[PDB]
Coordinates of C-alpha atoms in Angstrom, one line a residue:
Chain H
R1 CA -63.9 -10.3 -6.0
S2 CA -65.1 -6.9 -6.2
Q3 CA -66.8 -6.4 -3.0
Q4 CA -63.0 -7.5 -1.7
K5 CA -62.0 -5.0 -3.7
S6 CA -63.9 -2.1 -2.8
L7 CA -63.4 -2.7 1.4
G8 CA -59.9 -3.8 1.0
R9 CA -59.0 -0.1 -0.5
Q10 CA -62.0 1.8 1.9
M11 CA -60.7 -0.5 4.4
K12 CA -56.7 1.0 4.1
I13 CA -57.8 4.4 3.5
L14 CA -60.4 4.6 6.1
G15 CA -57.3 3.4 8.7
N16 CA -54.8 5.1 7.9
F17 CA -56.8 8.3 8.0
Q18 CA -58.5 7.2 11.5
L19 CA -55.0 6.8 13.1
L20 CA -53.5 9.6 11.4
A21 CA -56.1 11.8 12.5
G22 CA -56.5 10.2 16.8
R23 CA -54.3 11.9 19.3
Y24 CA -51.2 13.2 16.2
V25 CA -49.8 15.3 20.1
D26 CA -52.3 15.1 22.3
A27 CA -51.2 16.6 25.5
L28 CA -53.4 20.2 24.8
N29 CA -56.2 19.3 22.8
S30 CA -57.3 22.3 21.1
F31 CA -61.0 21.2 20.9
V32 CA -62.6 23.3 18.4
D33 CA -62.8 21.8 14.5
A34 CA -63.7 18.3 16.2
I35 CA -65.1 17.1 12.2
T36 CA -63.4 14.6 11.8
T37 CA -62.2 13.3 15.6
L38 CA -63.0 13.9 18.8
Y39 CA -59.9 15.1 19.6
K40 CA -60.1 15.7 23.1
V41 CA -57.5 14.8 25.9
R42 CA -58.9 11.8 25.8
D43 CA -59.4 10.9 22.1
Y44 CA -56.6 8.6 22.1
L45 CA -56.9 6.5 18.8
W46 CA -60.0 4.6 20.8
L47 CA -62.7 5.1 17.4
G48 CA -59.4 4.1 15.0
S49 CA -59.5 0.3 17.3
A50 CA -62.2 0.0 16.3
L51 CA -62.3 0.6 13.2
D52 CA -59.3 -1.1 12.2
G53 CA -60.7 -4.0 14.2
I54 CA -64.0 -3.8 11.7
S55 CA -61.4 -3.3 8.8
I56 CA -58.8 -6.7 10.5
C57 CA -62.0 -8.6 10.2
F58 CA -63.6 -7.5 6.1
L59 CA -59.8 -7.4 5.8
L60 CA -59.7 -11.0 6.5
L61 CA -63.3 -12.6 5.6
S62 CA -61.9 -10.6 1.8
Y63 CA -59.7 -12.9 1.2
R64 CA -57.0 -10.0 0.5
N65 CA -52.7 -11.4 -0.8
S66 CA -50.4 -8.1 -1.2
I67 CA -52.7 -5.1 0.5
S68 CA -54.1 -7.3 3.6
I69 CA -50.6 -7.4 5.6
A70 CA -51.3 -3.6 5.9
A71 CA -54.7 -4.9 8.0
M72 CA -52.2 -6.4 10.0
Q73 CA -49.6 -3.4 10.0
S74 CA -52.4 -1.0 11.3
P75 CA -53.1 -3.7 14.2
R76 CA -49.8 -3.5 15.4
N77 CA -49.4 0.1 15.2
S78 CA -52.8 0.2 17.2
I79 CA -51.5 -2.5 20.1
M80 CA -48.4 0.1 20.3
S81 CA -49.7 3.4 19.6
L82 CA -52.8 3.8 21.7
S83 CA -51.8 0.7 23.8
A84 CA -48.4 1.5 24.9
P85 CA -47.6 5.4 25.1
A86 CA -50.8 7.4 26.0
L87 CA -52.2 3.8 26.6
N88 CA -53.7 4.5 30.5
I89 CA -54.6 0.7 30.8
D90 CA -57.3 0.1 28.1
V91 CA -55.5 -1.7 25.6
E92 CA -59.0 -2.6 23.7
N93 CA -57.6 -5.3 21.1
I94 CA -59.9 -7.9 22.3
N95 CA -60.8 -8.1 18.2
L96 CA -57.2 -7.5 17.8
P97 CA -56.9 -11.1 19.5
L98 CA -59.3 -12.4 17.7
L99 CA -58.1 -11.4 14.4
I100 CA -54.8 -13.2 16.1
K101 CA -57.1 -16.4 16.0
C102 CA -58.0 -16.4 12.9
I103 CA -55.3 -15.2 11.2
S104 CA -52.2 -15.8 12.0
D105 CA -50.2 -15.5 15.4
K106 CA -52.4 -15.4 18.5
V107 CA -51.8 -17.2 21.7
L108 CA -49.6 -14.1 23.1
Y109 CA -49.6 -11.5 26.4
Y110 CA -47.6 -9.2 27.2
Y111 CA -45.1 -6.5 25.8
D112 CA -42.7 -6.7 23.4
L113 CA -44.7 -10.4 22.5
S114 CA -47.3 -10.3 20.7
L115 CA -46.0 -7.6 18.4
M116 CA -42.8 -9.7 17.7
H117 CA -45.8 -12.1 17.2
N118 CA -47.7 -10.2 14.7
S119 CA -44.7 -8.2 12.7
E120 CA -44.1 -11.8 12.5
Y121 CA -47.7 -12.9 10.5
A122 CA -47.8 -9.8 9.2
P123 CA -44.7 -11.0 7.7
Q124 CA -46.0 -14.3 6.4
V125 CA -48.5 -12.3 4.7
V126 CA -46.7 -10.1 3.2
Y127 CA -44.7 -12.5 2.3
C128 CA -47.9 -15.4 0.8
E129 CA -48.1 -11.7 -1.4
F130 CA -46.3 -14.3 -3.7
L131 CA -47.9 -12.0 -7.8
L132 CA -49.8 -8.8 -7.0
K133 CA -48.9 -8.0 -10.4
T134 CA -50.6 -5.1 -10.6
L135 CA -50.1 -1.1 -8.9
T136 CA -52.2 -0.3 -5.2
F137 CA -50.4 2.4 -4.2
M138 CA -49.6 4.6 -7.1
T139 CA -46.9 6.6 -6.9
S140 CA -45.3 4.2 -10.1
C141 CA -46.7 1.7 -11.6
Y142 CA -44.4 0.0 -14.2
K143 CA -40.4 0.6 -12.3
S144 CA -41.8 0.5 -8.1
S145 CA -40.7 -3.0 -7.0
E146 CA -42.2 -5.4 -3.8
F147 CA -38.7 -4.7 -2.6
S148 CA -39.3 -1.8 -1.7
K149 CA -42.1 -1.6 0.3
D150 CA -41.1 -5.3 2.2
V151 CA -36.9 -3.6 3.4
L152 CA -39.7 -0.8 4.7
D153 CA -41.6 -3.9 6.8
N154 CA -39.1 -5.6 8.1
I155 CA -36.4 -2.6 8.8
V156 CA -39.7 -1.7 10.6
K157 CA -40.1 -5.1 12.3
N158 CA -35.6 -4.4 13.3
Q159 CA -36.0 -0.9 14.7
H160 CA -39.3 -2.1 17.1
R161 CA -37.8 -4.9 18.6
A162 CA -33.9 -4.9 17.9
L163 CA -33.2 -2.1 20.7
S164 CA -35.7 -4.3 23.4
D165 CA -31.9 -6.0 24.2
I166 CA -30.7 -3.2 26.3
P167 CA -26.8 -1.8 26.3
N168 CA -26.8 -2.2 30.3
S169 CA -26.7 -6.5 30.1
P170 CA -28.9 -8.2 32.7
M171 CA -31.7 -5.3 32.4
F172 CA -34.5 -6.4 30.0
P173 CA -32.5 -9.5 28.0
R174 CA -33.7 -12.0 25.1
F175 CA -31.2 -14.0 23.1
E176 CA -28.8 -12.6 20.6
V177 CA -31.0 -13.9 17.3
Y178 CA -31.3 -10.7 15.9
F179 CA -27.7 -11.2 14.0
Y180 CA -29.8 -15.1 13.5
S181 CA -32.7 -13.5 12.3
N182 CA -31.4 -9.8 10.5
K183 CA -30.0 -12.3 7.6
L184 CA -32.5 -11.6 5.8
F185 CA -31.4 -9.4 3.1
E186 CA -32.1 -11.8 0.3
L187 CA -33.4 -9.2 -2.4
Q188 CA -30.0 -8.0 -4.2
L189 CA -30.7 -3.9 -3.4
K190 CA -29.6 -3.1 -5.8
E191 CA -30.2 1.3 -6.5
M192 CA -33.9 1.4 -6.1
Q193 CA -33.3 4.7 -4.8
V194 CA -30.1 5.9 -3.1
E195 CA -31.7 7.6 0.3
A196 CA -33.4 4.3 1.2
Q197 CA -30.4 2.1 0.5
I198 CA -28.8 5.2 2.7
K199 CA -31.2 4.8 5.7
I200 CA -31.9 1.0 5.8
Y201 CA -28.1 0.4 5.7
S202 CA -27.6 3.2 8.7
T203 CA -30.0 1.7 10.9
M204 CA -28.2 -1.7 10.0
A205 CA -25.2 -1.1 10.9
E206 CA -26.3 1.1 13.6
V207 CA -28.1 -1.6 15.5
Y208 CA -24.4 -3.5 15.2
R209 CA -23.3 -0.4 17.0
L210 CA -25.3 -1.1 19.6
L211 CA -25.5 -4.3 20.5
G212 CA -20.8 -4.4 19.9
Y213 CA -20.7 -6.2 17.5
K214 CA -18.7 -4.4 15.3
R215 CA -16.7 -5.6 13.1
Chain L
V1 CA 1.3 -15.9 2.6
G2 CA 3.9 -12.6 3.5
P3 CA 2.5 -10.2 4.8
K4 CA 4.1 -8.1 2.3
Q5 CA 2.7 -10.1 0.0
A6 CA -1.5 -11.1 -1.0
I7 CA -3.9 -14.4 0.1
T8 CA -2.7 -15.3 -3.4
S9 CA -1.4 -19.1 -4.6
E10 CA -2.1 -21.5 -7.5
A11 CA -4.7 -24.3 -8.0
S12 CA -5.3 -28.4 -6.5
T13 CA -4.5 -30.2 -9.9
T14 CA -1.1 -31.3 -8.9
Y15 CA 0.6 -33.5 -5.7
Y16 CA 4.0 -32.1 -4.1
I17 CA 5.0 -34.2 -1.1
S18 CA 8.5 -32.6 -1.8
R19 CA 8.3 -32.3 3.1
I20 CA 11.2 -32.3 5.2
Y21 CA 10.9 -32.0 8.8
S22 CA 7.3 -33.1 10.1
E23 CA 8.3 -36.2 13.2
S24 CA 6.2 -37.8 16.6
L25 CA 5.0 -34.7 19.6
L26 CA 4.5 -37.6 21.8
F27 CA 5.2 -37.8 25.0
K28 CA 8.5 -39.2 25.6
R29 CA 11.0 -40.1 28.1
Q30 CA 14.5 -39.3 29.1
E31 CA 14.1 -37.7 32.2
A32 CA 17.6 -35.8 33.3
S33 CA 19.2 -35.1 36.6
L34 CA 18.6 -32.6 39.6
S35 CA 21.8 -31.8 38.6
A36 CA 21.8 -30.2 35.3
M37 CA 18.9 -28.4 35.6
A38 CA 19.6 -26.7 38.6
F39 CA 22.6 -25.6 37.3
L40 CA 21.4 -24.6 34.3
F41 CA 19.0 -22.3 36.1
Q42 CA 22.7 -21.1 38.5
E43 CA 24.2 -19.8 35.2
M44 CA 21.0 -18.2 34.3
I45 CA 20.2 -16.6 37.2
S46 CA 23.6 -15.4 36.8
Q47 CA 23.8 -14.1 34.0
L48 CA 20.7 -12.0 35.6
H49 CA 21.9 -10.6 38.1
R50 CA 24.8 -9.9 36.6
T51 CA 23.5 -7.1 32.9
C52 CA 19.4 -5.7 35.0
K53 CA 19.9 -3.0 37.5
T54 CA 17.8 -3.3 40.9
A55 CA 14.9 -6.0 42.8
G56 CA 11.6 -4.7 40.0
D57 CA 13.0 -5.2 36.4
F58 CA 14.9 -8.4 37.7
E59 CA 12.4 -9.9 37.8
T60 CA 10.4 -9.6 34.6
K61 CA 13.6 -9.9 33.4
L62 CA 13.2 -13.5 34.5
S63 CA 9.1 -14.1 34.2
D64 CA 10.0 -13.1 30.6
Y65 CA 10.8 -16.8 29.6
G66 CA 8.4 -18.2 31.6
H67 CA 5.7 -16.2 29.4
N68 CA 7.7 -16.6 26.3
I69 CA 8.0 -20.9 27.5
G70 CA 4.1 -20.4 29.2
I71 CA 1.9 -20.5 26.1
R72 CA 3.8 -23.3 24.0
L73 CA 3.3 -25.5 27.6
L74 CA -0.1 -24.8 27.5
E75 CA -1.1 -25.8 24.5
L76 CA -0.1 -29.0 23.6
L77 CA 0.1 -30.3 27.1
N78 CA -4.1 -29.5 26.5
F79 CA -3.2 -31.6 23.6
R80 CA -2.4 -34.3 25.2
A81 CA -4.3 -34.4 28.3
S82 CA -7.4 -34.0 26.7
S83 CA -7.3 -35.4 23.9
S84 CA 0.4 -39.7 13.9
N85 CA -2.6 -38.3 16.4
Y86 CA -5.6 -40.7 15.9
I87 CA -7.9 -38.1 17.6
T88 CA -10.5 -38.9 19.0
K89 CA -11.7 -35.5 20.4
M90 CA -11.4 -32.4 22.3
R91 CA -12.1 -32.2 25.4
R92 CA -13.6 -28.8 27.0
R93 CA -11.9 -25.3 27.4
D94 CA -11.3 -22.8 29.9
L95 CA -14.9 -22.4 31.4
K96 CA -14.9 -20.2 33.6
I97 CA -10.8 -19.4 36.5
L98 CA -11.9 -22.9 39.1
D99 CA -10.7 -25.5 36.0
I100 CA -8.1 -23.8 35.0
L101 CA -6.0 -23.4 38.4
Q102 CA -7.3 -27.0 39.1
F103 CA -5.5 -27.8 34.9
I104 CA -2.1 -25.3 37.1
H105 CA -3.4 -27.9 39.9
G106 CA -4.1 -30.9 37.8
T107 CA -1.3 -31.7 35.8
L108 CA 1.1 -29.1 35.6
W109 CA 2.8 -29.6 37.8
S110 CA 2.3 -33.6 37.7
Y111 CA 3.9 -32.4 33.8
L112 CA 7.1 -30.6 35.7
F113 CA 7.8 -31.9 39.2
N114 CA 5.8 -35.4 39.2
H115 CA 4.6 -34.0 42.1
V116 CA 0.6 -31.9 43.4
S117 CA 0.7 -29.1 44.9
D118 CA -0.9 -29.1 47.2
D119 CA -3.9 -26.8 48.1
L120 CA -5.8 -24.5 45.2
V121 CA -7.3 -21.7 48.2
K122 CA -9.7 -19.7 47.2
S123 CA -9.0 -16.6 49.1
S124 CA -11.3 -15.4 52.1
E125 CA -12.0 -12.2 51.8
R126 CA -11.7 -11.8 47.7
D127 CA -12.3 -12.5 44.9
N128 CA -9.7 -11.5 42.7
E129 CA -6.8 -13.0 44.8
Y130 CA -6.2 -16.3 44.7
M131 CA -3.6 -18.0 45.5
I132 CA -2.0 -21.6 45.2
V133 CA 1.1 -22.3 47.9
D134 CA 3.6 -25.3 46.8
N135 CA 5.3 -26.4 49.7
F136 CA 8.5 -27.9 48.3
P137 CA 9.4 -26.0 45.0
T138 CA 11.4 -28.3 43.1
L139 CA 13.8 -25.9 40.9
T140 CA 15.0 -23.6 44.2
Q141 CA 15.2 -25.5 46.4
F142 CA 19.2 -25.0 47.1
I143 CA 19.1 -21.1 46.7
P144 CA 18.9 -19.8 50.0
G145 CA 15.4 -18.4 49.9
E146 CA 15.4 -15.4 51.8
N147 CA 15.4 -13.2 48.9
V148 CA 12.4 -14.4 47.4
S149 CA 13.1 -13.5 44.1
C150 CA 14.6 -16.8 42.6
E151 CA 10.9 -18.5 42.2
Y152 CA 10.0 -15.8 39.6
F153 CA 10.5 -18.6 36.7
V154 CA 7.9 -20.6 37.6
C155 CA 5.4 -16.8 38.3
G156 CA 6.3 -16.2 34.8
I157 CA 5.6 -19.5 33.5
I158 CA 2.3 -20.2 35.3
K159 CA 0.9 -16.3 34.4
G160 CA 1.8 -17.0 30.4
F161 CA -0.6 -20.5 31.7
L162 CA -2.7 -17.8 31.7
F163 CA -3.2 -15.0 29.5
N164 CA -3.8 -16.9 26.6
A165 CA -6.4 -18.5 29.2
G166 CA -8.3 -15.0 28.4
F167 CA -7.4 -14.4 32.0
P168 CA -4.3 -11.0 32.7
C169 CA -3.0 -11.6 35.8
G170 CA -1.0 -10.3 38.5
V171 CA 1.3 -12.9 39.6
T172 CA 2.8 -12.8 42.6
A173 CA 5.1 -15.0 45.2
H174 CA 5.4 -15.3 48.4
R175 CA 7.4 -17.6 51.6
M176 CA 6.0 -18.6 54.5
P177 CA 6.2 -21.0 56.6
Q178 CA 2.8 -22.1 58.1
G179 CA 3.7 -25.1 58.5
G180 CA 6.6 -28.2 59.1
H181 CA 7.0 -28.0 55.6
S182 CA 9.4 -25.7 55.6
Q183 CA 10.4 -22.9 52.5
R184 CA 6.8 -23.4 51.6
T185 CA 6.2 -20.7 48.8
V186 CA 2.9 -18.8 48.0
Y187 CA 1.5 -17.9 44.6
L188 CA -0.8 -15.2 45.9
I189 CA -2.5 -14.9 42.0
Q190 CA -4.7 -12.3 40.9
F191 CA -6.8 -11.2 38.1
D192 CA -7.9 -7.9 37.0
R193 CA -11.4 -6.4 37.3
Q194 CA -13.0 -7.4 33.3
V195 CA -12.7 -11.0 33.0
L196 CA -13.7 -11.2 36.8
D197 CA -16.5 -8.9 35.4
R198 CA -16.9 -11.3 32.9
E199 CA -17.0 -14.1 35.7
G200 CA -19.0 -11.5 37.5
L201 CA -21.8 -11.1 34.2
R202 CA -23.5 -14.4 35.0
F203 CA -21.0 -16.5 37.7
Chain M
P1 CA -13.0 -22.2 -4.8
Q2 CA -11.1 -22.5 -1.5
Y3 CA -9.6 -20.3 1.1
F4 CA -7.5 -20.8 4.3
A5 CA -7.0 -18.2 7.1
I6 CA -5.3 -18.8 10.9
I7 CA -5.8 -15.2 12.0
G8 CA -4.8 -14.7 15.2
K9 CA -5.6 -12.8 19.2
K10 CA -5.3 -9.0 17.6
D11 CA -6.2 -9.6 13.7
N12 CA -4.1 -10.7 12.6
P13 CA -3.5 -13.4 9.5
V14 CA -1.1 -16.0 10.4
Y15 CA -1.6 -17.4 7.7
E16 CA -4.1 -17.0 4.9
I17 CA -4.1 -19.2 1.9
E18 CA -6.4 -19.4 -1.4
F19 CA -6.4 -22.5 -3.5
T20 CA -8.7 -23.1 -6.4
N21 CA -10.0 -26.4 -7.8
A22 CA -9.1 -27.0 -11.9
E23 CA -12.9 -27.7 -12.7
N24 CA -13.1 -23.8 -11.5
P25 CA -9.7 -23.1 -12.6
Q26 CA -9.8 -19.6 -11.4
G27 CA -11.4 -18.5 -8.0
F28 CA -15.1 -15.8 -7.2
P29 CA -13.3 -13.5 -10.2
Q30 CA -14.2 -10.2 -9.0
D31 CA -16.0 -11.9 -5.5
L32 CA -12.5 -12.7 -4.3
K33 CA -12.1 -8.8 -2.5
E34 CA -15.6 -9.2 -0.7
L35 CA -15.8 -12.2 0.5
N36 CA -11.6 -11.5 2.2
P37 CA -11.2 -10.0 6.1
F38 CA -14.2 -7.9 6.4
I39 CA -16.9 -11.6 6.1
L40 CA -13.5 -12.5 8.1
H41 CA -13.7 -10.0 10.3
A42 CA -17.1 -10.3 11.2
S43 CA -16.6 -14.2 11.9
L44 CA -13.8 -12.8 14.3
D45 CA -17.0 -10.7 15.7
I46 CA -19.6 -13.7 16.3
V47 CA -16.5 -16.0 17.5
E48 CA -15.5 -13.8 19.5
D49 CA -19.4 -13.7 21.6
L50 CA -19.6 -18.0 20.8
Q51 CA -16.5 -19.1 22.7
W52 CA -16.9 -17.6 25.8
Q53 CA -20.0 -18.7 26.2
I54 CA -20.9 -22.6 27.0
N55 CA -23.9 -22.6 25.0
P56 CA -25.3 -21.3 21.2
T57 CA -19.2 -31.6 24.9
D58 CA -17.1 -30.3 21.2
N59 CA -15.7 -27.3 22.9
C60 CA -13.5 -26.6 19.9
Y61 CA -15.0 -27.3 16.7
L62 CA -18.4 -25.4 15.9
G63 CA -19.0 -26.2 11.9
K64 CA -20.6 -23.6 9.8
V65 CA -21.4 -20.5 12.4
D66 CA -22.9 -17.5 8.8
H67 CA -24.4 -16.9 5.5
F68 CA -23.5 -14.1 3.1
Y69 CA -26.0 -13.3 0.7
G70 CA -23.3 -15.4 -1.7
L71 CA -22.0 -18.2 0.1
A72 CA -21.7 -19.4 3.8
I73 CA -18.2 -19.8 6.5
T74 CA -17.8 -22.2 9.2
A75 CA -15.0 -22.3 12.0
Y76 CA -12.7 -23.3 14.7
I77 CA -11.9 -21.7 17.7
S78 CA -8.7 -22.9 19.5
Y79 CA -7.1 -22.7 23.5
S80 CA -3.6 -21.4 21.8
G81 CA -5.9 -18.1 20.8
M82 CA -5.8 -19.0 17.0
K83 CA -9.3 -19.4 15.3
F84 CA -8.9 -21.1 11.9
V85 CA -10.6 -20.6 9.3
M86 CA -11.5 -22.5 6.2
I87 CA -13.5 -20.2 3.4
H88 CA -15.3 -22.5 0.0
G89 CA -17.9 -23.1 -2.2
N90 CA -18.3 -23.2 -6.0
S91 CA -18.8 -19.1 -7.0
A92 CA -21.7 -20.3 -8.9
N93 CA -24.5 -22.7 -6.7
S94 CA -24.8 -21.8 -3.2
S95 CA -22.4 -24.5 -1.3
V96 CA -24.3 -26.5 1.4
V97 CA -22.7 -29.4 1.9
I98 CA -20.2 -28.4 5.5
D99 CA -18.9 -32.2 5.5
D100 CA -18.7 -31.5 9.4
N101 CA -16.9 -35.0 10.3
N102 CA -13.8 -35.5 7.8
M103 CA -13.1 -31.5 7.7
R104 CA -13.0 -31.9 11.6
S105 CA -10.2 -34.1 10.6
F106 CA -9.0 -31.7 9.4
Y107 CA -8.7 -28.6 11.9
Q108 CA -7.8 -30.9 14.7
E109 CA -5.3 -31.9 11.6
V110 CA -4.1 -29.3 10.8
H111 CA -3.6 -28.3 14.7
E112 CA -0.7 -30.5 14.9
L113 CA 1.1 -28.4 11.3
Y114 CA 0.8 -25.3 13.7
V115 CA 2.0 -26.3 16.8
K116 CA 5.6 -27.8 15.5
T117 CA 5.7 -24.4 14.1
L118 CA 4.9 -22.7 17.1
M119 CA 7.3 -25.0 18.9
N120 CA 10.0 -23.8 16.9
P121 CA 11.6 -21.4 19.7
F122 CA 12.7 -19.1 18.0
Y123 CA 9.4 -18.6 16.3
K124 CA 7.6 -15.6 18.4
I125 CA 3.2 -15.1 18.5
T126 CA 1.5 -12.5 16.2
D127 CA 4.2 -12.9 13.1
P128 CA 3.8 -14.2 10.5
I129 CA 4.6 -17.8 9.1
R130 CA 6.6 -17.7 5.9
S131 CA 7.3 -21.8 6.1
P132 CA 7.9 -23.1 2.6
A133 CA 8.1 -26.4 3.9
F134 CA 4.2 -26.2 5.8
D135 CA 2.3 -24.0 3.2
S136 CA 2.7 -27.3 0.4
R137 CA 2.0 -30.1 3.8
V138 CA -1.6 -28.7 3.8
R139 CA -3.1 -28.4 -0.1
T140 CA -1.5 -31.6 0.0
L141 CA -3.2 -31.9 3.4
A142 CA -5.8 -30.5 1.7
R143 CA -5.5 -33.4 -1.0
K144 CA -7.0 -35.8 1.4
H145 CA -10.2 -33.5 1.9
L146 CA -11.4 -30.9 -1.1

């Protein structure tokens, strides 16, 4: 299990590092200091996609339960960012769809569909984080919460699919299961930190005011 | 359960059957004469030409009676037609406009005047306007209807059949002799744009 | 621990009442104020955008509809305008029990008590009911179906 832990920590750090260090703002593309990245105008997370693909493969082969949903978070962030915004119709997510076949939530071929599917997959994997009983991000090691990361997980979910129900009605509609699938705060939420509560209630209120559900 | 007071009360662990006044509500039949109700309507219109200034305010001050009892006739006419009370079910509500103006056409006139108004014509040029014509209006047949201000009992009574139904609606009457049936009155009703646009979301 | 409401068209409660089982002998102490209008105000929101469509043949009765993080709510929509809401549940357990047909024989059964009071021609719309008899009738009509 030591090889699984070593590969887990190295793959998570390498996935986040090559994610944030490829195409951070690439509309001027200062090509000097090309050590850590390609950093040209055509450098949009392609090595980050290959590294995240190998990282998700080695994470599924590691077999974690707590840190393993961060691999799905990395692949979902890859297929969101480098296959939506600065995509230029590349969308190289073949091993990402292979990991969707292997772990959870395959069989989708659209924008705002496979992202929702892999979000459900990562939510199920974080539900499968039953009891890690340790410290992984070591900002807090005795007074911390798996609540404090799971609220950030589903608010990433809520901000990244609640806007797709447009406010112009008939343009891009789906069923109003956003409130139905929004009632998921069964957890206690009694003041781990006040600004987490403020941003969670600001977004939870703002989506109801967006969808016209005032009360 | 007063507005000033709270929702406060007591526990369920007793049985207070001290009740006074609750009875049946079924379709009774007593069928008074048209002369009696005609005299009732007659002295009512006499009071309204006494107390009111001009045309349009008298038209509103007639249609308010229909708005008083239109809600009342709506809910138990529906509770008798689409449903003591050993109740099977209560059936479907208003789906759209064209079932609820069928519901005036089906069983409001035959609740009131023992027949059916002869048409429920969807208009040609527009869709917010609709038009029902009664052929020989029963409760105003004696009044010489050259002023058409005397049939706004029934424009008031159908507006309060649709204001509960969620369709706010300008409801007017005109009278037009299109047939050998004389003095037939058209109730050209309108709507507002918004529940027309709530219909206009999907139809 | 049961809480009845009849809430009108312009958000006014024309009849709202609580009662308690004596096996609880009180009701929702310190929770009786968040389980009031705000939860019911959002219940008005969900029956506002649940009535006007055909599809989420019984258009009036709707059963259990939503759930805050302590209990769950039920509903009923009449074509009079009014939207009946009963709020039930012992506060210790998460009360699951929706009987769904015998308390369907409450909503069509309390409906006529609203009907005969609406047929009082002195009684207007958009004003509450201080009947001393119709509120004593309904708890005994809830003595039928607890």
